[PDB]
Enzyme design. Structure first.
Site, PDB file in Angstrom:
ATOM      1  N   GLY A  25      -0.892   3.305  14.405  1.00 51.97           N
ATOM      2  CA  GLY A  25      -0.878   3.827  13.057  1.00 51.97           C
ATOM      3  C   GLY A  25      -0.324   5.224  13.145  1.00 51.97           C
ATOM      4  O   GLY A  25       0.056   5.674  14.232  1.00 51.97           O
ATOM      5  N   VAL A  30      -4.406   1.827  17.228  1.00 55.49           N
ATOM      6  CA  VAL A  30      -5.402   1.019  16.523  1.00 55.49           C
ATOM      7  C   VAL A  30      -5.930  -0.056  17.463  1.00 55.49           C
ATOM      8  O   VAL A  30      -5.157  -0.732  18.149  1.00 55.49           O
ATOM      9  CB  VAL A  30      -4.919   0.436  15.165  1.00 55.49           C
ATOM     10  CG1 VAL A  30      -6.064  -0.272  14.436  1.00 55.49           C
ATOM     11  CG2 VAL A  30      -4.319   1.530  14.273  1.00 55.49           C
ATOM     12  N   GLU A  92     -11.324  -1.798   7.820  1.00 52.23           N
ATOM     13  CA  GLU A  92     -11.412  -3.240   7.660  1.00 52.23           C
ATOM     14  C   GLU A  92     -10.437  -3.945   8.607  1.00 52.23           C
ATOM     15  O   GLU A  92      -9.258  -3.573   8.679  1.00 52.23           O
ATOM     16  CB  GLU A  92     -11.080  -3.582   6.205  1.00 52.23           C
ATOM     17  CG  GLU A  92     -11.066  -5.053   5.878  1.00 52.23           C
ATOM     18  CD  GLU A  92     -10.890  -5.313   4.393  1.00 52.23           C
ATOM     19  OE1 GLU A  92     -11.209  -6.444   3.971  1.00 52.23           O
ATOM     20  OE2 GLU A  92     -10.513  -4.381   3.640  1.00 52.23           O
ATOM     21  N   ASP A 136       4.675   4.171   2.170  1.00 52.12           N
ATOM     22  CA  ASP A 136       5.123   3.477   3.375  1.00 52.12           C
ATOM     23  C   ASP A 136       5.024   1.950   3.231  1.00 52.12           C
ATOM     24  O   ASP A 136       4.573   1.242   4.139  1.00 52.12           O
ATOM     25  CB  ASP A 136       4.419   3.973   4.658  1.00 52.12           C
ATOM     26  CG  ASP A 136       5.163   3.653   5.944  1.00 52.12           C
ATOM     27  OD1 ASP A 136       6.373   3.322   5.877  1.00 52.12           O
ATOM     28  OD2 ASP A 136       4.538   3.722   7.020  1.00 52.12           O
ATOM     29  N   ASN A 141       3.096  -3.231   7.080  1.00 48.01           N
ATOM     30  CA  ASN A 141       1.916  -2.645   6.462  1.00 48.01           C
ATOM     31  C   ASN A 141       1.235  -3.548   5.434  1.00 48.01           C
ATOM     32  O   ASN A 141       0.358  -3.104   4.701  1.00 48.01           O
ATOM     33  CB  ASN A 141       2.212  -1.267   5.896  1.00 48.01           C
ATOM     34  CG  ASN A 141       2.548  -0.272   6.973  1.00 48.01           C
ATOM     35  OD1 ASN A 141       2.285  -0.483   8.183  1.00 48.01           O
ATOM     36  ND2 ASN A 141       3.110   0.848   6.553  1.00 48.01           N
TER      37      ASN A 141
HETATM   38  N1  LIG Z   1      -4.094   3.616  10.321  1.00 49.51           N
HETATM   39  C1  LIG Z   1      -3.676   2.548  10.304  1.00 49.51           C
HETATM   40  C2  LIG Z   1      -3.270   1.205  10.293  1.00 49.51           C
HETATM   41  C3  LIG Z   1      -1.905   0.860  10.117  1.00 49.51           C
HETATM   42  C4  LIG Z   1      -1.549  -0.473   9.987  1.00 49.51           C
HETATM   43  C5  LIG Z   1      -2.537  -1.479  10.040  1.00 49.51           C
HETATM   44  C6  LIG Z   1      -3.911  -1.132  10.258  1.00 49.51           C
HETATM   45  C7  LIG Z   1      -4.926  -2.165  10.357  1.00 49.51           C
HETATM   46  C8  LIG Z   1      -6.103  -2.136   9.605  1.00 49.51           C
HETATM   47  N2  LIG Z   1      -6.820  -3.297   9.832  1.00 49.51           N
HETATM   48  C9  LIG Z   1      -6.129  -4.080  10.722  1.00 49.51           C
HETATM   49  N3  LIG Z   1      -6.496  -5.350  11.106  1.00 49.51           N
HETATM   50  C10 LIG Z   1      -5.596  -5.969  11.918  1.00 49.51           C
HETATM   51  N4  LIG Z   1      -4.426  -5.445  12.380  1.00 49.51           N
HETATM   52  C11 LIG Z   1      -4.089  -4.151  12.001  1.00 49.51           C
HETATM   53  N5  LIG Z   1      -2.927  -3.548  12.596  1.00 49.51           N
HETATM   54  C12 LIG Z   1      -3.111  -2.265  13.369  1.00 49.51           C
HETATM   55  C13 LIG Z   1      -1.670  -1.668  13.530  1.00 49.51           C
HETATM   56  O1  LIG Z   1      -0.874  -2.616  14.222  1.00 49.51           O
HETATM   57  C14 LIG Z   1      -0.708  -3.886  13.611  1.00 49.51           C
HETATM   58  C15 LIG Z   1      -2.072  -4.561  13.367  1.00 49.51           C
HETATM   59  C16 LIG Z   1      -4.929  -3.397  11.097  1.00 49.51           C
HETATM   60  C17 LIG Z   1      -4.281   0.225  10.383  1.00 49.51           C
HETATM   61 MN   LIG Z   2       3.143   2.384  10.668  1.00 49.87          MN
END
Ligand SMILES: N#Cc1cccc(-c2c[nH]c3ncnc(N4CCOCC4)c23)c1
Ligand SMILES: [Mn+2]
Length: 290
Positions: A25, A30, A92, A136, A141
């Protein structure tokens, strides 16, 4: 004053079992984690504050914006914890993958594209009604739960509009998805997210945004110079028109998110989010054979 920040006696290494890195992120990595008290899975962003300077202001704003959001279309925020020099941001967890991942096994059909765009629009309508600008918007995202629910994530560059500050001018976002008025640092508002949505619609249809094969510096002159991108290929007229509606150089000519929820492309093609589990399963199977 960081919103949702917990007691320093609370040890997040005790309250959460940190598991594998799931991505990145803004400002930090993350990880997948388990809340030790409820056994629910959470997403944890870790920021080394000692490895930062002039970013803490942007870190505080991300947390503030996340904490003020209360919507089924925006990733929930569960608080922040400080462990030595490291800030743990608890969010979450969404186990279905990002809309971008779901594109890996092959193209989406127009029902899937319309369903995803409709849910993004629900998120954008919420944010814009709260005088917030995501800034963004891109398929990476846009996250899905294991049930097919679609939510907005990555509030790393989100902005807040007030009765006094009706417009923003900050250069923030991901080059390929940035609106011409944002790149040129002109006064801008929620309409910038509508342009990024148009780019996201091309990305969901084609697999990549326009100019994806170019250096992001080239797009910094191309986006304000060139006529807006269009969706090229054998796609429906309502889908090409949806894209064109978002991708107008004049922000006042872009519809609002609320208006786009009634666009013929959405109304004629979108279905229940529960059907998106077919896309999630397709990705799981594909992943298993890589
Ligand atoms: N700061 C922040 C940020 C940015 C983008 C996504 C998330 C994210 C929140 N809950 C998730 N649950 C499952 N995969 C997730 N992502 C992590 C980032 O890599 C891809 C997979 C998330 C957090
Ligand atoms: Mn990003």
């Amino acid at each position: 004053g960081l919103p949702g920040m917990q007691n320093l006696k609370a040890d997040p290494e005790e309250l959460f079992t940190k598991l594998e890195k799931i991505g990145k992120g803004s400002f930090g990595e993350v990880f997948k984690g388990i809340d030790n008290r409820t056994q629910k899975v959470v997403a944890i962003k870790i920021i080394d504050l000692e490895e930062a300077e002039d970013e803490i202001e942007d870190i505080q704003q991300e947390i503030t914006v996340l904490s003020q959001c209360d919507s089924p279309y925006v990733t929930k925020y569960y608080g922040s914890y400080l462990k030595d020099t490291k800030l743990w941001i608890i969010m979450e967890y969404l186990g279905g993958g990002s809309a971008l991942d779901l594109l890996e096994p092959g193209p989406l059909d127009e029902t899937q594209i319309a369903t995803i765009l409709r849910e993004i629009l629900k998120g954008l309508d919420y944010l814009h009604s709260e005088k917030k600008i995501h800034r963004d918007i891109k398929a990476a995202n846009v996250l899905l739960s294991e049930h097919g629910e679609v939510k907005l994530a990555d509030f790393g560059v989100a902005g807040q509009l007030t009765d006094t500050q009706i417009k923003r001018n900050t250069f923030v976002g991901t080059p390929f998805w940035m609106a011409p008025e944002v790149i040129k640092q002109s006064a801008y508002d929620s309409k910038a997210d509508i342009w990024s949505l148009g780019i996201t619609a091309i990305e969901l249809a084609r697999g990549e945004p326009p100019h994806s094969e170019l250096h992001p510096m080239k797009v910094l002159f191309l986006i304000p110079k060139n006529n807006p991108p269009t969706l090229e290929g054998n796609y429906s007229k309502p889908l090409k028109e949806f894209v064109e509606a978002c991708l107008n150089k004049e922000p006042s000519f872009r519809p609002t998110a609320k208006e786009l929820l009634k666009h013929k492309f959405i109304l004629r093609n979108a279905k229940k989010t529960s059907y998106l589990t077919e896309l999630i399963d397709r990705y799981k199977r594909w992943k298993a054979e890589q």
